[PDB]
Subunit: 224 residues, 4 copies
């Protein structure tokens, strides 16, 4: 049951960051998981959560000590964040998250990766990709709301790596995850970071997280 | 010069609707076309322009007529749009306009179509598509910022039609066009509606619109 | 009656610009005028309309001509707005419009003016005001969704003029007017410009425009 | 020293909730604090912060327990919120927060109150107010970014109280407070909750918090 879970993975996996389980967060989660929630509502709530999620994830970056001088002509000591970053959406669901990134980071560069599992073989292949030219030089915020089998995010990381990105500079921004998924990611790429809002029980006979949220891209974009 | 072309198209193509050429619109247009514009300014201004464009476009739908009684307790005669719609973006460039549609139309279903020209052969092939199941019964707001040779959009309409959408129900939303694209669209699919913001002079050697904007998707997403 | 009324204003006051009467514009108005409209919807649509209305009025500002060079190394000739502006809202209903204004012109300075119709008489009286320092030198986007008697706005212009604002530099943005309010404004301040989206028939003994919208401020902020 | 002050506030007033001092939060405050920051920049960050702050405050509301069933047919146990709420802004600075509140609570009723400290002396006097009439029955998101002497928020509290709002039903949303201010709020109305994002060191002869931000109202509204 729930509490065990978070305890184990939080314990076993030091690079995942779970968002504070506030009442609001649960409240939001409650609406988005409800199979009865109408489309307009699902996207309103998803977007909100998502913004919180990114603000959370943003803390994962390197920063500057910075001293400022206030209007009172007095000194203040802050921080300044300096890394070159960019967002990389996993098509199609991760796209739903680009909006929020763009909301807090205006004009961020946005890479895209469409990955698909063979209809027969089940193997995940890189179908299409469009990424910044110097991505090898920046911190990447990988976006995909779901991590069931870790099948998809793993292929994505793989390709980013072949492009020259450092494993430690990738920030996997997820909304919901299964333990399996979390383990695989760390198994293959222990140096990445993962921020998430929820970890569920397990995967369905069908490979669907449970109790879960269903097909996210479907409920978000309205193609269900 | 331009007024001619404008005239010619306005005359020869009854289904196109060029938008109001205001000094505001041109001012936006000048910012977005400038090679010197920074990604942030570029996205802000395109976003704004896009909003205006979607507003224009939505006027292309069928609407009822409606009497309402006001707080002053006197009836009022207005209209109501009663059709079932959805937006269909042409990946990737058409994606920048999804935000705008969602902004005026909360929770409108978003279909996606990825068309790509064979790298040897030059032709359009449908690569990926994820659309609404009842699309055959809806009004399609097709999104694609640019219309140079009309290759993409044309392949996009074909697929839509094989699914069952009514040709006269497709509303091709565009920012910038080149006369021949318009021409081609219309030779092949005469019953579609097209709303756009600018019509440019000619295409270039590279099939780039001129004086144009450059590569829209690259400038909007930052994979410059 | 409407047309005849619209045209007459139009022919009668060269300085008033009347928003384009699109079916969408009417759809929007019908929902906001409907007595039966829920508060969340009313704000949604009101905001929707405000954005278009604001975009319209911005066309009344001055501009230079600018030729830029496209990414395709070819010149484009557009224009640019060089102009120090600011919005001034009339508390409290006009505050519902500053959002729209801040949405299109980032960090635009905003002044506020609170006027109160005296209880004995009803002579408008200035309760409070906080405006830019250098306002004498700016174009003013004066904000007030309703213009019944024009008592509030005329008083507002009065003070603006007292501070040094040039009359011809005031752009009065509004959503709904009564012919009677229009006449007073231009009779008193012939040199200002006024952009509206609708003109209604009469005013009541309670000074409510009819068929009208009811109390805007209460409807928008939810204080019925 | 901050810690000290911070922890000491924390240990002393069971009822205040400080926002988690993330590096992000400090980066934001750093920008908005620098005298050197530009108008549009100040507003962008101030707004970004405010939204986080509001999400924080919303967790002070009461919630039910709720169970729904997932699209996969397995139940989930969430927690519904369900109370009549509303925001009340202290003009003019607090109105800078209504947007934030309106962003997450669609069409939330907004009340406004404007208070002036009488020159001569210094007792704030109520200048104007417009509130829901349903208010004695609601939870109130009282908004005011700076809390120096606390003279204003206490006066607002005083009128809300007079109107019949239950003291323990008032959530005071703040950005920067001064201990002295916090102290007066609790000595006068201890049953209230206060959510802030920062606690500075001292108030000065002209009553400005230090290191502080300067005048919030005019920096955000640009009337400085
Ligand atoms: O539960 C899951 C797993 C993968 N993708 C989804 O949308 N849902
Ligand atoms: O000019 C053109 C042609 C195709 N795609 C673009 O973005 N621009
Ligand atoms: O009808 C009217 C007239 C003035 N002000 C309003 O809010 N409504
Ligand atoms: O520092 C201060 C104190 C009060 N009000 C402000 O705007 N700033």
């Amino acid at each position: 049951q729930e509490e065990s879970i978070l305890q184990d993975i939080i314990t076993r996996f030091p690079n995942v960051v779970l968002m504070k389980q506030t009442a609001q967060l649960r409240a939001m989660m409650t609406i988005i998981r409800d199979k009865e929630t109408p489309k307009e509502e699902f996207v309103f709530y998803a977007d909100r959560l998502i913004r919180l999620l990114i603000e959370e994830a943003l803390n994962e970056l390197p920063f500057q000590k910075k001293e400022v001088t206030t209007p009172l002509d007095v000194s203040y000591h802050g921080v300044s964040f300096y890394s070159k970053i960019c967002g990389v959406s996993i098509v199609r669901a991760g796209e739903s998250m680009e909006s929020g990134l763009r909301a807090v980071c205006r004009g961020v560069r946005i890479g895209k990766i469409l990955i698909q599992r063979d209809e027969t073989t089940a193997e995940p292949k890189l179908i299409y990709e469009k990424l910044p030219a110097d991505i090898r030089e920046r911190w990447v915020m990988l976006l995909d709301p779901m991590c069931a089998t870790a099948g998809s995010v793993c292929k994505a990381i793989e390709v980013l790596l072949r492009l020259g990105v450092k494993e430690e500079r990738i920030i996997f921004v997820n909304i919901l995850a299964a333990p399996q998924g979390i383990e695989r990611v760390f198994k293959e790429y222990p140096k990445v970071r993962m921020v998430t809002a929820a970890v569920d029980i397990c995967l369905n006979s069908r490979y669907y997280i449970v109790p879960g949220i269903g097909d996210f891209g479907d409920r978000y974009f309205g193609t269900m």
